[PDB]
Structures are given as structure tokens and as C-alpha cells.
Amino acid sequence: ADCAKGKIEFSKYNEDDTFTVKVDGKEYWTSRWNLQPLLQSAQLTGMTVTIKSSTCESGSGFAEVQFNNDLE
Amino acid sequence: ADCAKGKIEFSKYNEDDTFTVKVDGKEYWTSRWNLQPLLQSAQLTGMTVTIKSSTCESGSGFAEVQFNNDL
Amino acid sequence: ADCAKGKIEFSKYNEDDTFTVKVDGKEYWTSRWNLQPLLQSAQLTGMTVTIKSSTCESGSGFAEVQFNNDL
Amino acid sequence: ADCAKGKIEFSKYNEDDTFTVKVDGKEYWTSRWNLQPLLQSAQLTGMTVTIKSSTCESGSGFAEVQFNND
Amino acid sequence: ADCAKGKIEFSKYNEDDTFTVKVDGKEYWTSRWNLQPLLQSAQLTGMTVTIKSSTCESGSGFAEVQFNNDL
Amino acid sequence: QVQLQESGGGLVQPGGSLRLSCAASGFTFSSYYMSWVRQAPGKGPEWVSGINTGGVGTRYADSVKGRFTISRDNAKNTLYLQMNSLKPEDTALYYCAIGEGGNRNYWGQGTQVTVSS
Amino acid sequence: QVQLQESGGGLVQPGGSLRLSCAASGFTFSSYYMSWVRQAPGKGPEWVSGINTGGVGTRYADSVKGRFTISRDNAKNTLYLQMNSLKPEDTALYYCAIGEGGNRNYWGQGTQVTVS
Amino acid sequence: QVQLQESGGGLVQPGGSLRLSCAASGFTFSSYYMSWVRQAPGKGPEWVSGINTGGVGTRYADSVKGRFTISRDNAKNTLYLQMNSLKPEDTALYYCAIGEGGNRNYWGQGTQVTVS
Amino acid sequence: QVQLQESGGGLVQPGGSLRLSCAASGFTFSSYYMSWVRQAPGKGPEWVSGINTGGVGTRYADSVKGRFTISRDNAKNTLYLQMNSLKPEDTALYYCAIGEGGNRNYWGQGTQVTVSSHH
Amino acid sequence: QVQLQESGGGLVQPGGSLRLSCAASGFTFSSYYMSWVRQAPGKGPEWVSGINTGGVGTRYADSVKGRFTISRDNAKNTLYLQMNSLKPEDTALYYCAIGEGGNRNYWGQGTQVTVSS
Structure with a gap:
């Protein structure tokens, strides 16, 4: 159940040792x-990340992501 | 047994903390x-991975992998 | 509170296994x-890091940061 | 004793969580x-690795190495 | 005290799980x-490392080190 | 068998307090991030709070920040939720969820919370 | 020292159920990913199901997802496979394996499942 | 259920000494970097001192270097701050914090130290 | 201190069997990969077998695969080598080593194995 | 709090032996690499020997290699140095140090070792 598909806008290491990523204007944490x-x-290489989650609109974090390299 | 030999199409971190890779159109997890x-x-550097496993059908588990640089 | 926003000038591994980074002329450790x-x-890629901390004076400890690529 | 000096031909993650590298036609694991x-x-950067081990036969395990760029 | 400032000549993983680096012709381990x-x-990126230690003779142990990019 | 047993719910008057408890078994509890999710009637599921393995590092949804406080007892394999100053907007069925709460299969059968007059 | 002892097999009728159990010894079981693999006569080995150390994360082969369910009792060093609504294709020798089941070195002497 | 209990504060004359104690519970203390932060009235928060797990690696703010000494008893799950030769510039509320002290959620209800 | 005490060697006739055991002390054994290395007089040291902490992941040299079995008892801090169907080529002094062999500092004072007959 | 107490020094004739002991307290001894450093009169500080936690991985300075042997008892929080076949060039104050010995604050007060005829 694909949450966001896109290049990582930014990443953020959190005080609670979680990690946020802004993909396709939406922030996700893990x-x-x-x-x-x-x-x-x-984020650095410019990969195509697909964030997958069952409960995509709860504010719950993801733990399933697909990585694809960029094409040109 | 060599299941797949090729460049990594994509990788995926799974909910159960395993890791899938699709090599030569077949998906394998570890x-x-x-x-x-x-x-x-x-996958990033464009290496040619060789997935070795007793179970060779797509979706099988694997553990032994050989890495060779692009040429 | 955003303490410093900028490219990492230098990093330093400390004797107490902490790690210092000087960002925008101010040093912060984690x-x-x-x-x-x-x-x-x-530091290597030239990312613009944003150090967030309640203690913003140089030499303070931090543990929350945001990474953005360069333009 | 310097067993092999050269560029890593290939690397291999083993079922027993060890790691093999073939350097100068000889395989060594750690x-x-x-x-x-x-x-x-x-392997990726093309570094010239020097495998040091008391057992120098191919298939021998090692632990000490030296890394130099090209 | 700054023992050595320079590019890493070579690195070496030791049998005792320590790590040696020769910087400015002097070897130091951690x-x-x-x-x-x-x-x-x-070593790979060509960074100029600054080894800081109370024991500065070649072969001494160290822990503190500063990393700066090439430019 | 993995089991999560929520308790501590019920009927509270607005402004009141409640302490939810979830007793985990059948898996190594200390190895998992734990969170609380609520399901309000008619609305979809809402993630409410989270806590790292360690019990020091908490996260809260903006809607409960300041009123709720998550804790864990790794020695007792229990997860808690201290709900203070309860608004009616909190009348929901509260699930204790293994992980970030993104998967309903890894929830227990909820504890009902009803804040009314 | 390491030993895996599968049991719970037999001849079941199609649509029926079976609960395979594998009793592990000679290694700390709680520390390993465990999986089940089947070897049908004439066919090659097929990975069936897997379970993580943590004890919450399960994986299933597409062919058996929904009908089978893997579990572990770290207290009893046993791995289980609940096989419900059995089809004749599932007729095979089931191995209990340490890890992902990718090298036969880590399987037990399997239990026979016959669905006819 | 995380708790940090600071004690050992009070009214001291300049040049005097004090020993703050922070008693940690509800988490395995021995697994965390600990630090002390002071909040002077009207001013912002100031990080003062830090100590690694294991207790050998200390850090001090330049303003306190030489006068203050952080220590930890991983056995009594307590963190200490030995404040010697106290200047009026140190008149703040001393918080004991889990980690580096960069987030107020990671502090206890601070003890008061007044040097006049 | 760290100590490795090999035992179980001796004079074996070709085709015979032996069980080498090495009793480790002075370090937490359960935390280290262990291996067996042999060194025959005149030849250099030969790595024989290896075992990961846990005892599931075993490696064998091509020359011994099938005849030898490495095992460990982390409860008894002992490492074993079951040598079946021995050849005169298996004659050497067998060292028990911490890690993958490689550094003689990590071996023990070996156990002698001598495969011979009346010829 | 952190304390290192060296002992076992004294006057030894050349070729003789000595066993230095350092008793650590106030920190989790078992979690640190430990080393021995000597300070000869007129010369600077010389690192002598090192041991990783666990006590398998030893390192020695070329000047002592083969004559000295470092060990540790993590159960007794003690670090040892077996000095055999002593040359006069070993006459120095021997400090027991936390880590690689690159921080003087984390050395003891030294033990004297004088080798002469």
C-alpha cells in the first residue's frame, strides 16, 4: 500500500533515535x-524511494521501503 | 546453486526487518x-551479484551472495 | 530551536567517543x-545540515539534525 | 606473512556469516x-589490499589487512 | 597535542581488531x-586528518582525530 | 503466541484521567518499538503515541501532546498510557500496537475509552 | 551437536489440516531466524515460511499464504507450521531449517506430508 | 516510566561548594550518556557537563572547566556534579538530563542553586 | 589469562579415528569464532576447520571436508574436532586457535596426531 | 571516583623479572582497552603495551616485544604486566592507562622500576 513514491527531499535524525524523511511533500518516520x-x-544518490504502509493516514511510522536508482 | 546472476533491479527493506532484492527478474530475501x-x-555502484541458494524459485530465502564490479 | 544551518566545515571524533561538527562557525557534539x-x-557530500537543540551556545550537545543536499 | 597483494577480484558473503575475497587468484575468508x-x-574503489596471515594457502582464513589506494 | 596532520597514506585492520593509519610517515593505531x-x-576521499594524542611517538595509541575535506 | 492485552479503559468525566495498560507476551518485547493507536467511531485510525526500545525516547501526536505520556516496563513486558485532562474528542477504542502502528495485525483487541457527561 | 527433529506429518485428505512441529537442540534457538522448506518428489526445493528472532515478523510463500501459519515457542525450542485447507500440490517432505533455508546443511531429516 | 530526581542544591556563599545528585529510575541508566544543564533566570539554557556510559569520558563547558566535576555510579544509578569555588554567574536551576541535554523532555524537575 | 588446552591426539592407524578437544579459559569463549590449524613438520601451517560463535556455521578445508567435523560446547567452553578416516597426510601437530587461525599468538600448545602403520 | 593503583615495582638486577599490577575502580573496567606507558627520566612518555577488553588482543612496543606480557582480570578489575629479561633501558615510572594511553588524565600515579647492578 504505497504511501509516497519519490526522491528524498530531506532526512532528519530525531531526539528519540527515529528517522524522518520528506518524500513527495509528506513526512514519514521510522x-x-x-x-x-x-x-x-x-537521499544522496537520488534514488526512487517507495514508502509502503497499511495504515497510511494515521501518523504511524513506516518500516517498509523500496529503493530504485534514478534513470539519467 | 546459482539462482540469479545480475545487476540489482531494486532492493526493499521489509516490515519483518528482512531485505528483498530483485535480480534477473526474480525476488530473493535475506x-x-x-x-x-x-x-x-x-545496487548503487552497479555490481553483478550472484545469488546462491538451495531454494531457487522467486520469493525464496537466500544468504550466500557474490559481488563483482561492473565492466 | 535551529542552532546552525550550513555545510560541515570539519568533524572530529573525540576521546570520549562523542562526535563534534563545526557548522556555521559554532561547534556542536553528539x-x-x-x-x-x-x-x-x-560533510563529504557537501550537505547543508540543520542542528536543532534547546541549548544553542557553541560547545553544547545536540541530537537532532536535518540533512538537505546542495544546489 | 603477506599472502596476497592486489585488487579485489570479487567478494562473497557466506552462509556462515564470514566473508571471502579472491585477491591475486587466491581466496581468503574472514x-x-x-x-x-x-x-x-x-573492492569498489579499486584499492590494492595486502592480506597478512600465518596460513597462506588459498582457502585459509585471515584477519589482518592493509589498504592502499591506486 | 597534534601528532600528525595529513592525508592517510594507508590503513590496516589488525589481528587484535585495532586499526592502524600511517599519517605523515608516522603510524598510529586505535x-x-x-x-x-x-x-x-x-583515506578514500583524500581527507586531511589531524591525530591528537599525549603519546606522539610513531606506534603510539590514539583516539581523538579531526577530519577536514581536501579542497 | 503473540498477545497484547489492553486494560484500564472505561467511562471518565471530561477533564478526568485514565491509565491504560497493555501486557505483551509471546515475543521479545524489549526488541520492539511500541505505540498506542486510537480508532474513533466513524473516523479512521489515529496514531497517538510511540516509545523506543529503552523507554526513554517518546513521540506524541499533536492532538494529545502534553496530556498523554507513554511509558514501558521492559522488566514486566508492559506498555502504559497516562491520559490526563481528557476531552470528548478522545472517546475511542485504544489499541496497543507492536511497532509504529502501521499494521493492524500486530494490534491487540482494544480497550474502550469514553469521556462523557 | 545441532539437531532439528520434525514431526506431525502423515496422510491427510484434501481440505484437511496438520500441525508440523520441529524440536531444535544444540544451539540457542531463540537467536536464529527459522524457516520451513518443502521438497516435492520430482520437483526442486520450495521455501514455504519464515519467522524472525523477535518473534513477531512472519513471511510466507505465495503458494501457501493464508492457509499456513508459522510460530515459535522459544521456551520449548520448537518451531511450528499450521497447515490448513491442504491441496494435493503440498504433498512433500517438509524440512525445518535454521535461517532462510538456503543451504541443506541447516535442515533436519524432514517429516512426510501426503495429501490425497 | 522515566524519572530523574535532582537534589543537593541550596544557598551557598561565593567560593563555597555543593554536590548535586540526580537519582535515575525507570530506564537502564548504565546504557545512556548523561549530562547536566543550568537555566539562569531570564537567560536561555546552558549545557554544563557531560559523562559517557562507563564513566571515564567527561566533557565540561568552558565556563565551568576546572571548578565542576561530573561523575556517575552506574551501581547506585545516580549522576553527580561537584561544584567547587562557586561564582555568582552560576546562580541557575540545575537540570540532570538523559543524553546531551538538547531537549527539555529529557530533563528532570531541576534543583535550585543560589550563590550570593 | 587466556588459555587453550588441546588434548585427544595420539598414534592412529590409517582409516582410524580421533577426537581432539580444546578447553578454553580466561576469555568469554562464546564470543569468539574458533578454528583448528595443523602444521606438519617440513610444511607450513594449514588451516583445517572453523566454527562461528553459536556452532551452526562450520567451514572446512578441501583436504578434510567430509572426514572432519568441528563442534563447540559454549556451556563447557570446549572446541572439538572429530577426525574420521585418517590418512598419513593428516599427520601434523594440531593447534586450536581463537579466530580464523592466522596469528600464532592466538593458537594453543598443540596436540600431536600421527597416522602411520607397519610400512 | 576513577582510580588506578599501580604496584609491583622496585629494584631489579639486569636479566631479572617483575610483575606490575594495576587495580582499577570507579568505572566499568571490563568496557575499556587498557594499556601500560612508561616515562623514562629525561625522555618523553613511551607507550609499552596494550590489551583489548576481554583480554585476547595484545599489542607491544617493538622495544619490549618478546620480554613483556600484558594481561587482565576483568573479574578482579586488575591489569598486569609481566616484565621478563629486564635491560637498564626499562628504568622508568610505569603508568597504567585507560585506553591507548594517549590521555595523561587517565593514568595512575606510576610504579617505579629500576634495573641496575
């Missing part, structure tokens, strides 16, 4: 640690 | 945390 | 281990 | 988790 | 695990 280096890489 | 940064760096 | 590689990559 | 990202970056 | 990825990135 408690997953392994996602932190994967997401900024994706 | 529970290994150490493979996550290795696979992402491979 | 005890977060996960921030070390993130700040390292932001 | 149980060190710290080395996995270091060796991948060395 | 037991800090977090420094391992920071140092090779610095």
Missing part, C-alpha cells in the same frame, strides 16, 4: 536503525 | 543484517 | 553513534 | 564483521 | 571501532 544509512544513501 | 548495506552499495 | 557515519557522509 | 564494509569499499 | 569506517572514508 524506528528502524538499519534504515538510517539506507535512507541517506538513497 | 534475514542477514550485514547484507543490507552490502546489497545497497552493490 | 553522543549518538549512528550520527557519526551520517555526519561523515553529509 | 570472520570479522568490521571487515565486510571495509573490503566492499576497497 | 581500539575505537567507530573510527574504522570514518578513517577509510577519510
Whole structure:
């Protein structure tokens, strides 16, 4: 259930050790640690990130993301 | 057994903290945390990954992977 | 409160395993281990980092930051 | 003892969470988790790695290495 | 005290899980695990590292270090 | 079997307080971010609060920030929610959710909260 | 030392149910991802289901998603597979495996499931 | 259920000494960097001192370097601040904070220190 | 201090079997990859077998795969090597090592294995 | 609070042996790399030996390699140095240090070791 599909506008490390990313004008946060280096890489390289969640309109964080490289 | 040999099409971090990669049109997932940064760096750099597994159907679990640079 | 917004001039690994970054002429340190590689990559790539803290004087501790790529 | 000096031909993550690298036609593996990202970056960047081990036969395990750029 | 300021000549992962770097012809090692990825990135990117230690002779141990980009 | 058992709900007068408790079993509780989500009648699900493994690092939805406070007891495998100064807008069925609360399969059967006069 | 002992197999009729159990020993079970793999006669090995260390995250093969359900009892060092509404395709020798089930080194001597 | 309880404050004459104590509960203390922050009346918050887990690695603000000494008893799950040779410039409310002290949610209900 | 005490060697006839055991002390054994290395007089050191902490992930040298089995008992801080169907080529001094072998500082004072007959 | 107490020094004849002991307190000893540093009269401080936590990984300065042996007892929070076959060039004050020995604040008060005839 694709929440947002796009390039990472910005990322933010939070005081509670979570990680926010603004994708397609909407902010998403995750408690997953392994996602932190994967997401900024994706941000830096200009990757196409697809944030997936069942409850997409609750303010609940994601933990499922697909990474695709950019085309030209 | 060599299941897939190719460039990573896409990678996906799963809700169960596993990691999927689609190589040669077939998706394979791994529970290994150490493979996550290795696979992402491979996909980004354009490496030719060789997925080795006893279970070769798409959706199978894997653990052994070989990395070779682009040429 | 946004303490500093800018490119990382330098980073420093400290004897107490903390990590200092001087952003916009002000130095700020963090005890977060996960921030070390993130700040390292932001410094190298030339990202514009936004340090957020209740304590904004130079030398204060921080743990919340935002990363944006360059133009 | 310097077993192999050269560019990493290929790397391989093993089922036992070890990591193999073929340097100068000889394969060597390591149980060190710290080395996995270091060796991948060395392979990708084209660094000339020097594998040092008391056991120098191919298939021998190692732990000590030296990284130099091109 | 600033022991060495310069580009990393080479790095070496040791059998005791320490990490040596030769900076300005002098070798220095560290037991800090977090420094391992920071140092090779610095080595790879061509950063000018500043090793700070009370023991400045070659072969001494160290922990504090400052990273600055090439320019 | 993974089980989450919410309790502490009921009928409270507006301005009143309540303390929700969720007793987790069948999984290693200390390994998971825990959160509370409410489902108001007619409305969709609303994420309310979250807490990191460790119990130090909390998150709150803007609607409850200042009135609610999430806590965890990793020694007792329990998650709590202190609901103070309750508005009627909080009359909802409160679920204790494993993770960020993005998956309803990983919720327990909710505890009913009704703030009325 | 490591041992995996599958049980709970047998001959079931189509639409029926079975609960396979695998009893692990010789390693701290609670520390490993566990999975189930089936090997049908004439066909190759098929990964069926998986479960994480944490104990909450489950994965299932498309062929059995909705009918099968993996669980673990870290207290009893046992892994289970609840097979409901069984189709004849599922006729095979079921292996309980440490990890993702990608190398036969880590499987037990499987239990036989026959659906006819 | 996180709690930080500062104590040891009071009225001291300039040049005098005080020992603040902060008793942590509801989280595993030994796993967190701890720090002390002061909030002078009318002025903004000032970070004062920090100590790593393990208790060897201390940090001090330049304004307090040499006079103050942070310590921790991971056994008594307490954090301390030894304030010697107190100047009137130190008249603030001393908060004990989890982490680096950059977020007010991570502080206890501070103890009062008045040097006049 | 750190101590590794190999035992279980001896004089074995070709085709025979032996069980080497190394008793570790002075370090938390459960936290280290362990391996077995042999060194035959005249030859250099040969890595033989390896085991990850946990005892699920075992590696074997091509020359010993199928005949040898490495195991560990983290409860008893012991490492074992089951040598079945031995050859005179298996003759050497067998060291138990912390890590992947590699650094003689990490080996123990070995156990002698001698595969021979009446020829 | 943090305390390092060196002992085991004294007057030794060349070729002789000594076993230095350093008793650590006030910090979790088991969590730190420990090392020994000597300060010869007129010369600067010389790092001598190092040991990682856990006590498997030892390092020695080339000047002592083969004669000295560092060890630790994390149960007794003590660090040791076995000095065998002592040369007069070993005459120095031996500090027991937290870490790699690159911070003087985290050394003890030293133990004297004098090798002469």
C-alpha cells in the first residue's frame, strides 16, 4: 500500500533515535536503525524511494521501503 | 546453486526487518543484517551479484551472495 | 530551536567517543553513534545540515539534525 | 606473512556469516564483521589490499589487512 | 597535542581488531571501532586528518582525530 | 503466541484521567518499538503515541501532546498510557500496537475509552 | 551437536489440516531466524515460511499464504507450521531449517506430508 | 516510566561548594550518556557537563572547566556534579538530563542553586 | 589469562579415528569464532576447520571436508574436532586457535596426531 | 571516583623479572582497552603495551616485544604486566592507562622500576 513514491527531499535524525524523511511533500518516520544509512544513501544518490504502509493516514511510522536508482 | 546472476533491479527493506532484492527478474530475501548495506552499495555502484541458494524459485530465502564490479 | 544551518566545515571524533561538527562557525557534539557515519557522509557530500537543540551556545550537545543536499 | 597483494577480484558473503575475497587468484575468508564494509569499499574503489596471515594457502582464513589506494 | 596532520597514506585492520593509519610517515593505531569506517572514508576521499594524542611517538595509541575535506 | 492485552479503559468525566495498560507476551518485547493507536467511531485510525526500545525516547501526536505520556516496563513486558485532562474528542477504542502502528495485525483487541457527561 | 527433529506429518485428505512441529537442540534457538522448506518428489526445493528472532515478523510463500501459519515457542525450542485447507500440490517432505533455508546443511531429516 | 530526581542544591556563599545528585529510575541508566544543564533566570539554557556510559569520558563547558566535576555510579544509578569555588554567574536551576541535554523532555524537575 | 588446552591426539592407524578437544579459559569463549590449524613438520601451517560463535556455521578445508567435523560446547567452553578416516597426510601437530587461525599468538600448545602403520 | 593503583615495582638486577599490577575502580573496567606507558627520566612518555577488553588482543612496543606480557582480570578489575629479561633501558615510572594511553588524565600515579647492578 504505497504511501509516497519519490526522491528524498530531506532526512532528519530525531531526539528519540527515529528517522524522518520528506518524500513527495509528506513526512514519514521510522524506528528502524538499519534504515538510517539506507535512507541517506538513497537521499544522496537520488534514488526512487517507495514508502509502503497499511495504515497510511494515521501518523504511524513506516518500516517498509523500496529503493530504485534514478534513470539519467 | 546459482539462482540469479545480475545487476540489482531494486532492493526493499521489509516490515519483518528482512531485505528483498530483485535480480534477473526474480525476488530473493535475506534475514542477514550485514547484507543490507552490502546489497545497497552493490545496487548503487552497479555490481553483478550472484545469488546462491538451495531454494531457487522467486520469493525464496537466500544468504550466500557474490559481488563483482561492473565492466 | 535551529542552532546552525550550513555545510560541515570539519568533524572530529573525540576521546570520549562523542562526535563534534563545526557548522556555521559554532561547534556542536553528539553522543549518538549512528550520527557519526551520517555526519561523515553529509560533510563529504557537501550537505547543508540543520542542528536543532534547546541549548544553542557553541560547545553544547545536540541530537537532532536535518540533512538537505546542495544546489 | 603477506599472502596476497592486489585488487579485489570479487567478494562473497557466506552462509556462515564470514566473508571471502579472491585477491591475486587466491581466496581468503574472514570472520570479522568490521571487515565486510571495509573490503566492499576497497573492492569498489579499486584499492590494492595486502592480506597478512600465518596460513597462506588459498582457502585459509585471515584477519589482518592493509589498504592502499591506486 | 597534534601528532600528525595529513592525508592517510594507508590503513590496516589488525589481528587484535585495532586499526592502524600511517599519517605523515608516522603510524598510529586505535581500539575505537567507530573510527574504522570514518578513517577509510577519510583515506578514500583524500581527507586531511589531524591525530591528537599525549603519546606522539610513531606506534603510539590514539583516539581523538579531526577530519577536514581536501579542497 | 503473540498477545497484547489492553486494560484500564472505561467511562471518565471530561477533564478526568485514565491509565491504560497493555501486557505483551509471546515475543521479545524489549526488541520492539511500541505505540498506542486510537480508532474513533466513524473516523479512521489515529496514531497517538510511540516509545523506543529503552523507554526513554517518546513521540506524541499533536492532538494529545502534553496530556498523554507513554511509558514501558521492559522488566514486566508492559506498555502504559497516562491520559490526563481528557476531552470528548478522545472517546475511542485504544489499541496497543507492536511497532509504529502501521499494521493492524500486530494490534491487540482494544480497550474502550469514553469521556462523557 | 545441532539437531532439528520434525514431526506431525502423515496422510491427510484434501481440505484437511496438520500441525508440523520441529524440536531444535544444540544451539540457542531463540537467536536464529527459522524457516520451513518443502521438497516435492520430482520437483526442486520450495521455501514455504519464515519467522524472525523477535518473534513477531512472519513471511510466507505465495503458494501457501493464508492457509499456513508459522510460530515459535522459544521456551520449548520448537518451531511450528499450521497447515490448513491442504491441496494435493503440498504433498512433500517438509524440512525445518535454521535461517532462510538456503543451504541443506541447516535442515533436519524432514517429516512426510501426503495429501490425497 | 522515566524519572530523574535532582537534589543537593541550596544557598551557598561565593567560593563555597555543593554536590548535586540526580537519582535515575525507570530506564537502564548504565546504557545512556548523561549530562547536566543550568537555566539562569531570564537567560536561555546552558549545557554544563557531560559523562559517557562507563564513566571515564567527561566533557565540561568552558565556563565551568576546572571548578565542576561530573561523575556517575552506574551501581547506585545516580549522576553527580561537584561544584567547587562557586561564582555568582552560576546562580541557575540545575537540570540532570538523559543524553546531551538538547531537549527539555529529557530533563528532570531541576534543583535550585543560589550563590550570593 | 587466556588459555587453550588441546588434548585427544595420539598414534592412529590409517582409516582410524580421533577426537581432539580444546578447553578454553580466561576469555568469554562464546564470543569468539574458533578454528583448528595443523602444521606438519617440513610444511607450513594449514588451516583445517572453523566454527562461528553459536556452532551452526562450520567451514572446512578441501583436504578434510567430509572426514572432519568441528563442534563447540559454549556451556563447557570446549572446541572439538572429530577426525574420521585418517590418512598419513593428516599427520601434523594440531593447534586450536581463537579466530580464523592466522596469528600464532592466538593458537594453543598443540596436540600431536600421527597416522602411520607397519610400512 | 576513577582510580588506578599501580604496584609491583622496585629494584631489579639486569636479566631479572617483575610483575606490575594495576587495580582499577570507579568505572566499568571490563568496557575499556587498557594499556601500560612508561616515562623514562629525561625522555618523553613511551607507550609499552596494550590489551583489548576481554583480554585476547595484545599489542607491544617493538622495544619490549618478546620480554613483556600484558594481561587482565576483568573479574578482579586488575591489569598486569609481566616484565621478563629486564635491560637498564626499562628504568622508568610505569603508568597504567585507560585506553591507548594517549590521555595523561587517565593514568595512575606510576610504579617505579629500576634495573641496575
